[PDB]
Symmetry: D3
Subunit: 271 residues, 6 copies
């Protein structure tokens, strides 16, 4: 298993820029072509929510064009910036397991050594996350049924506070429900999130829990300052690899940079 995992694309409508000046559409199209050009090719691409910025049909038309040009199987989940019904309308042909109920989108993938669980933590009319009873029951059923096989969950909102003054108030509101699932099921070992536009990682019992950077604009972590900052610090994605019994995640830069070159001992330490 190799997954390429990106988040928070924030597509805008045709010929608009984010905030009038960040060309998210072009930036994301570069990202798509970079993923398409990888020498070690992913088995699939994950996009963990906030696919569009404003929930508009015209933004989804751009998302479908750019995401649909990815040359991989896609696993897509909504964020709070998404509109559930439009997300299904425009993206279900790119991820057929999202199904037909805008309010119960979720799916499991059993192709690999670890089970993958994709859920919707977004809730209409708020930035905060919410896990419904049906999502929780479905999770319990999948973890129960999976038995001994490890599982990873992908969701938009972090299920616990991370100390980030901007982002904490809008985390997953009843995230304790999912934390109760990591207590009950030892096989649940990864929870990966979007929303925070930052690589922020913590550990609860046996599960590693981590947010991801955005594909374009980032949000700095502040512990006290609640001013709503964003910036254009370097974007990246996370690569997830099955390595024996270990699930290993590593950061892959989406910036254009100098190199690579080859290490040579004579060049490293000249005489």
């Amino acid at each position: 298993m190799l997954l390429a995992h990106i988040s928070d694309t924030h597509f805008r409508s045709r010929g608009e820029k984010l905030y009038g000046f960040i060309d998210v559409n072009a930036a994301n199209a570069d990202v798509v072509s970079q993923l398409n050009a990888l020498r070690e090719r992913p088995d699939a691409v994950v996009v963990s929510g906030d696919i569009v910025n404003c929930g508009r049909p015209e933004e989804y038309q751009v998302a479908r064009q750019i995401l649909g040009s990815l040359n991989y199987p896609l696993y897509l989940i909504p964020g709070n910036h998404d509109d559930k019904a439009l997300f299904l309308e425009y993206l279900q042909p790119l991820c057929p397991q999202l199904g037909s109920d805008a309010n119960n989108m979720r799916c499991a993938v059993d192709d690999f050594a670890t089970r993958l669980l994709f859920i919707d933590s977004s809730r209409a009319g708020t930035s905060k996350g919410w896990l419904t009873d049906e999502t929780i029951s479905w999770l319990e059923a999948q973890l129960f049924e999976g038995g001994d096989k490890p599982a990873t969950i992908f969701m938009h909102h972090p299920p616990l506070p991370l100390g980030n003054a901007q982002m904490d108030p809008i985390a997953c509101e009843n995230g304790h429900r999912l934390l109760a699932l990591v207590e009950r099921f030892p096989s649940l070992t990864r929870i990966f999130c979007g929303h925070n536009h930052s690589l922020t990682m913590t550990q609860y019992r046996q599960a590693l829990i981590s947010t991801l950077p955005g594909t374009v604009h980032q949000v700095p972590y502040c512990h006290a300052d609640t001013d709503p900052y964003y910036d254009l610090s370097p974007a990246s994605c996370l690569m997830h690899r099955q390595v024996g019994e270990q699930w290993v995640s590593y950061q892959h830069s989406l910036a254009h940079y100098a190199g690579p070159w080859l290490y040579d001992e004579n060049i490293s330490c000249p005489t």
Copy 2:
């Protein structure tokens, strides 16, 4: 607790550049001034190994000058590129807990809600890591006496393979001795490493285990390809914060980038 954690500085001697072209001395002096300018100031700065590139006295002269200009308490550990005896000579006044035995450098910090354990996984004559009997014994004693107080270990070499073709052959060779300690001591929940010049994270039982990017040059993760690449993809460090019961780590960019600006809902979704 707020820690700024940087790694793999690879200082060169005065007026020399890494590989003849990467100005590590200047990039590191920038980094130092960046850390000195932080608005939310860390309590301490960790540097997790490969302080110098060639283990030369004249490189430690530079390292002492630049690291010596950080306005913070420092916790310094060696890597495989370091010379243990010069490390003590030139850096012990900056981290006095390193003591006077070049072959037994380690120390524990009890100032915070989580215990900090700093060790030397480096071995002379090899790039591979090695945990000595003295080190493993000291670790067991710390963890036994710590009781239910959480513990974090900082070491140069990762204690398990991560699937990185370049890096796995030179991980910590007897790292299973540390994995045995994670098994035995549930309070051991974080292990942070240098060496890989990449943010690569995994989980073993209750312990989150992660390598850090370098402060200057980076090493791409490859699964198959053994060619020894390095590049100038974006540099960063890790900030570690105690957030109630959770240790939270987040990535802090050391690049110069555009912004911050302030999110405004009108600008975000114009009419």
Copy 3:
């Protein structure tokens, strides 16, 4: 009093770029977000003319939306690139004190220790500036009424030759009439202008007279060469502050640059 003073925005219609390649609309949206994000917030933003590039209705639609997203009271005046009627129609709601006569747009502001006088020096069918009889009488009356209260005038066109080969022929054609006002009224101590896309400054009796850089492209100063050049040298604005009895202007960069860091005596001069 703190004023942020920008000039010569040259907005184009939606999705268009200046000369087909300079993204003025994006650059200006970035500027507006910079101004909104200032820690020391100005009391008002001045925009001294050439708001649009071609005087077209769709350019004004973009200007109204982008300038309308500034979180400040605005003072707007036209330049030669503007169209007076459309300027009034689209922009007057953002600056109502201009009145409702497109041919006599001007205003006095008395909120601060120094009186602010905003006038229209643009003339239909020409790049040249022109001061109407009405504007001059209004100016004389304002300056009589004001007595020993200091006054600053903002206008598009500079009142006198500056030796700039490209710009001098298209300065204020009857600028002598404003210079006459400077001789007669010791209270008139500042004249700030757009048009030249350059920080150019001179003194006539008690008055400091300065043109401003543009927000995007700049015009180099050449003494002999009349080739009509432009460039993308760095953009800035002037901040104007009342410091006791002094009106102080300082340049504020609108470029994205490395820093800031903190000065440290021992880093500056190491031993």
Copy 4:
């Protein structure tokens, strides 16, 4: 008269970078080559103090090499980071008009329509400026003898506070003495200063008073915050030109940027577009 005017070069010793990471020596060598390559060549180059960073003889060796490669007559004055004796020992050959007394370095230039007065406002032991009695007396003598001929003063420290929280406490401490000269002598119409690493301008009676950007690093203007910031925002110099009866100053970017191109009416307002 055309003058190129740069300030606060802050040269470091050979093979040293400012703060360990800003290559001030390389940046200044680029600036010198930029000034040498100008199509419209200045009559002289002014450098208004803080020529070196630490007052060290090794920094003066570098300053002398780099400023000595300028293909122009130089007018140099010190700043607080300069050491008076070393400044004269190393730089007097580049600007012999300053004399041979390190405590009284100044000169007047009468070649042009406006008289140019260069003074040392620096004072040993402090960052603050200070006008000595001999400087003040020399100034009064020049201004008296100049009569109706306009005059421009170049000095390191600004002679009045400008609202800059970091820089104001270290302005010219007896600046009021020079402001009294502005009142007395109507032909004194320009005072140009370094020190602030910022283009900050104001007017006091008939005199325009402006500080300059540095050639490398800059200092942001902050009204309340005393935190000693600096940054690498774009560097520039000031060009000063006599245009008829007007002294005109314009900013000349020292950054490397795209262009120039030529304006074309058809390209500006295309018949195809909204």
Copy 5:
């Protein structure tokens, strides 16, 4: 004679970017203004094919506007990404000497010491080049009538393989027909081509044969790897100059870069340094 020669502009529809992220329309607008701003002004500009990306009418609307804004006579030829009928409809008014037959667009220019020959090697339904009987027969007639006077051919597709694994399979399929004319006619001493988005040159008998860089995106030369790579490595055009008896071609960067400065002996080899 001075010609500025650009190639492979790949214009897109108004508001569209190439592959969604390369702003070819803006990049080409910058290039046009760069050409308009040249101090040493060319006598004409050559554009050697792949004018639009997808052969669509909306792309030709953009090409016509931007190429239309060049302040020079234009010599335009198609590439495989062009549609011949639309190319003629939209661009013939910019290069009327092509004629009125979309299937037989070529022209010869006799203004200079060397004859210029512009031909269309593109063929509908394929990326490969193809020299038609009409084209070869007209080339022969031009070369034969030309007698002594040297000749230069401008065509989209290279007429021989160049060892480029990506590009060779889509060269001029019957390029041998043009190599046969090189053999027959010692007058024919240059053939310049687009298609490859690379400066690649070779020599066949008396003729120098060269492909050009693109104005925006480039294509790396690979000898074995057939992965279809492209990149944003530096763009440039070729300038062609008659220099007495020699035709001289030189690379002109279209990138925005630092400089120029002026060389100085004192600065090149300082007396202070090793």
Copy 6:
């Protein structure tokens, strides 16, 4: 045959920069590592003169270390900036085929399908090129020796004027002697030169004649202007490849740039 061909490296002594601000030493060390990292490995690397800037011993020290770290056989020739005796002393161990006479450095290589002839056109006391009686006699002998086997000459100075106002006066002054050999010997079909810091190409009879870009700073071609300009427009090398009967040269960028990506029909022309 694959040759990587660079030129005009202009090395300075350790710690020095060209003109005080162009870091030739780092730029060239970057180039050397780029060449070492090439996927399609050249058979050899040619460096066609002006190896050092000032002809000083400490410059040759830097050149020897940096060029010595190329993992390829080298063919090195001097330019006018080089000193013949010091060139031999420091660089002849890197290219022993040159011989042991400083005033007669040259060699012929028969390894490939095209013979390679390396000559010294530099002359003490001048920037102009000169072919000595010995050099010209040797070339004649070698062209007799090659018979119908093709030949390529590498030299520093171009043997004919190219209309470049700065460079023509200091071309190879008796270059006509080489043009005479082209006429006599039809297998001589390439002449490659340094000196001009420009890709400028022409054809004389059967011989293609081309100057190369430098590795760092470039010289613009001007027809009339003799002002001695240099700039930092993009650097490159030429790769020379034997392709059946054709010698093919192609430009290889030494800049760091975005990409590569993979072309995709549906991304190129969306529907």
